Symmetry: C3
Subunit: 309 residues, 3 copies
């Protein structure tokens, strides 16, 4: 029974793949962490394969739906999930096959850069994007895709090239967030989009995780600064959580998984660097519990014929 | 004759307490600086006690006025003056009683973080905050409170935790200022609020003062960068001063005292580091003269039954 | 046949002077680079002299046109080209006569700081600047003028003072760009102003070029970060180029020459530091070809009686 896969579902393998990598970084401190990493990584990779196959079907048989999402000044952003997750799967696979991993990383990096270059810039022509288009999802092509390239390139040994992507994402972040939070202040985000508030958790933690990958895990002043703003945003989003889910818990809450998983990844580096170890443990446990809850609610929905379109 | 204390009056002990700390930092260069520091610090602490007592009375007998200021998307910010000044008084008291100082610092830090977490985030629900709510006072809970925690925690020996607060404030600053200055460009701030333009002086100087506390007074590239933007803002506000006071000099001009006092504090570190010593001397003298003028106009108003509500 | 010189034409000597300085920095790697630098520098200096003479005539005989551009919340910005180019000519002249160079640098630095202090701040009074005034040209007095002072002061040996100007420009940039790109998203820039999109290329490259002047050419994390965002903007502007010139190629395209020339200058430092040498070569060649095309189209227009007003 054919159906067009909602692009946002790539957030599921994305969150799982990022959490696999966080656990990978604990292996030398806690050897059993590698088994947990490998299991999360295989599950994320499997889900990614499936979703890539489903999306290839969407492109072949439901192309006009993709074209409409592509030209939308709001919905285009979710497409960036595709190359982001491709890169994270490459990072996972690198532990087993660096050749295949490097192919996936380059495909994702070229694909996300071509994507942004075509669409993010086109917004600057005016008249299509409106004030009401100012959504957290914009972080995906503008910010998160660049941080993911930064960290993946560093994994491959291209640290200086990674810094270029890092810079592109960090400055893009700082340049978009002001107008986003002002818009949220003035305009009440409608319930159907509120789960995407979870993406507001992402920038500072995805940023510091990419930074720590490129700088060999040196926890310095910048990294601490980023963690500070990251936790501020976490506390804000926690207070806002009842309003976020005013209309009920739903699968869109996977939007939080990117920032959660990056908070866990960055915590491993803070722990290794003997900076705020107690905070690190808390951060790492919290993010795992929250993602575990997402998995449980996803298994629940799956067994009730919900989930898919 | 009972009366409800206007919350903004906490700006007076705030400015004096911050100026006490600036002088404290000169003691080893100029021993008489410690007497000047102690006198400013005792006066600020005394005024703070009084104002805290008056505000406790406001909470008990005029609670609905506090509730209205609290839920206002503009007036809520002045409440942040309370924990900020509590921390600065703790910093002063630390020279005499580190135990009491540490209690005040933690009360202020927890109180300001709870405050922001409850109210600054709630703004993101939309529909209450309006474009016309975009006032410089927002810096108080969003930016200045975090910088004050950063510096106070560093005083207590919690440097890495201080960096987290520093980061939260520095990034929050950069994220709010763009929309503030655009709003000021487009919308003429009404005279009754114009004294609060003085708060625009604060961010860069309060930032660098907190930075220098946490990094042991090392005047590095970041510190110089911050000073640069700080002076730009000073020059802009000086040119704007006749327009700020178009409707007359008033007590609201204490709004400038936070940035002035922080400019004096940061100047002590620049002087100790042998960076721009001539600029430092100028900055330190200027801020003291300006705060001295504020004291004189406050003594004036006090002797004319003006001042209080 | 008297005529009032359009202020924007100072962009021509500006671009050429900045490109002279980029080549100057290659002299020790490639000795023939000094001849290319000297020729570009003499041509830029000659054009500057002429344009300064023409503008002195405009001030004497067409003063009301200058007054109107000065008080315009949009057109005032182009006036900043005057002190910027004065400084860059001083930087060029320094190779032959450091005394004269230092006079020009100080005149430009004092002039641009007085200019911004008078006009950029005055915008904050509200009611004159409108949303539709949010143009890329604002970068000139707010950002580029400060970076140029930073680098020129460093040339003169005033590195710490240069850092203050650097800071003023870097933070000003970060504070304006968010509202600029949001405005471009929402409002289609009209064709007659679209050439000024070229100024969007400038900030990151002019920033890193100034940074590298003040920090003795040390290619560090900040410099790489800036280059990253710089290239992102380049790719975006390249995709947008057909829309920029939808109504035809014109002399306003000299607006791109500031970012192009700074990209070439920064590339010399990256090359000297053995960072991304291949990218550096590409950047340096690209910018030269693009500026060469501008020269060719300018010679073309000159020989067809176009060009001047
Ligand atoms: C995975 C993301 C892919 C997004 C699909 C790109 C949409 C391209 O867009 C369309 O392509 C058509 C021709 O094929 C043109 O005729 C249309 O003008 C254009 O709208
Ligand atoms: C995620 C992998 C990369 C996506 C490539 C999408 C190809 C889009 O294709 C191009 O997109 C432009 C959009 O601005 C359209 O104007 C063009 O019509 C179209 O050819
Ligand atoms: C908007 C966020 C910007 C913050 C970045 C500035 C932090 C840079 O901090 C720098 O880091 C080095 C390593 O710890 C320190 O040694 C330097 O002395 C310090 O200036
Ligand atoms: C990001 C957090 C990941 C690391 C979690 C490890 C939790 C271990 O716990 C710690 O183990 C130590 C020695 O191994 C003990 O010294 C500590 O006191 C104990 O807290
Ligand atoms: C020092 C700052 C304190 C701010 C006062 C908090 C305002 C709380 O708010 C009020 O509390 C009431 C119950 O007591 C509720 O009934 C109301 O719904 C709520 O408006
Ligand atoms: C400065 C010291 C800390 C202030 C604590 C204030 C307690 C506020 O109280 C809570 O505030 C919420 C506001 O968003 C309200 O919604 C709640 O009704 C109220 O209980
Ligand atoms: C928006 C403001 C951001 C500016 C922060 C960047 C400045 C960081 O500057 C860094 O500081 C170190 C200490 O001086 C230097 O040694 C580093 O080499 C330099 O990259
Ligand atoms: C932030 C500024 C605080 C310090 C102010 C000190 C002013 C002292 O003045 C300085 O004293 C020096 C030696 O002590 C002399 O060498 C200097 O030339 C003189 O300028
Ligand atoms: C090179 C830039 C110079 C800009 C010209 C400044 C415009 C000054 O402005 C004008 O000056 C007049 C008196 O001379 C006043 O009468 C006017 O009120 C004022 O508009
Ligand atoms: C580029 C060299 C420096 C330019 C100096 C311009 C002098 C402007 O002159 C002043 O400008 C003010 C504008 O805000 C006006 O209000 C004043 O009327 C005018 O005297
Ligand atoms: C918005 C842009 C802000 C980015 C500035 C932060 C970069 C500062 O980076 C700092 O630079 C030093 C020199 O390479 C490093 O050694 C420090 O360890 C690093 O923290
Ligand atoms: C910003 C770029 C400026 C420098 C351009 C130089 C191009 C020279 O080319 C380089 O010359 C080298 C030795 O001199 C050879 O080793 C290289 O392989 C070759 O690429």
């Amino acid at each position: 029974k054919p159906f067009p896969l909602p692009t946002g579902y790539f957030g599921i393998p994305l969150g799982l793949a990022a959490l696999s990598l966080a656990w990978f970084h604990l292996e030398n401190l806690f050897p059993a962490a590698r088994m947990v990493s490998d299991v999360l990584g295989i599950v994320a990779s499997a889900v990614w394969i499936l979703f890539i196959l489903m999306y290839a079907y969407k492109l072949r048989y439901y192309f006009e739906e993709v074209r409409a999402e592509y030209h939308s000044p709001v919905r285009f952003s979710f497409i960036a999930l595709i190359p982001i997750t491709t890169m994270l799967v490459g990072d996972i696979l690198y532990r087993w096959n660096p050749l295949i991993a490097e192919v996936l990383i380059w495909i994702g990096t070229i694909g996300q850069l071509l994507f942004s270059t075509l669409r993010v810039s086109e917004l600057w022509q005016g008249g299509v994007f409106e004030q009401k288009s100012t959504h957290p999802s914009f972080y995906l092509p503008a910010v998160a895709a660049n941080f993911t390239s930064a960290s993946s390139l560093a994994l491959l040994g291209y640290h200086d090239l990674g810094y270029l992507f890092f810079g592109a994402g960090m400055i893009a972040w700082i340049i978009f967030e002001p107008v986003l939070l002002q818009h949220l202040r003035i305009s009440s985000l409608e319930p159907q989009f509120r789960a995407t508030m979870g993406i507001v958790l992402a920038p500072a933690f995805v940023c510091v995780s990419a930074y720590l990958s490129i700088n060999h895990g040196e926890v310095d002043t910048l990294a601490k600064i980023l963690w500070g703003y990251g936790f501020l945003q976490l506390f804000f989003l926690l207070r806002l959580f009842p309003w976020i889910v005013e209309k009920g818990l739903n699968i869109g809450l996977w939007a939080f998984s990117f920032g959660l998983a990056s908070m866990a990844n960055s915590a491993t580096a803070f722990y290794h660097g003997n900076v705020l170890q107690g905070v690190s443990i808390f951060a790492f446990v919290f993010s795992n519990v929250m993602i575990g809850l997402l998995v449980l609610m996803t298994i629940y929905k799956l067994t009730k014929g919900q989930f898919f379109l």
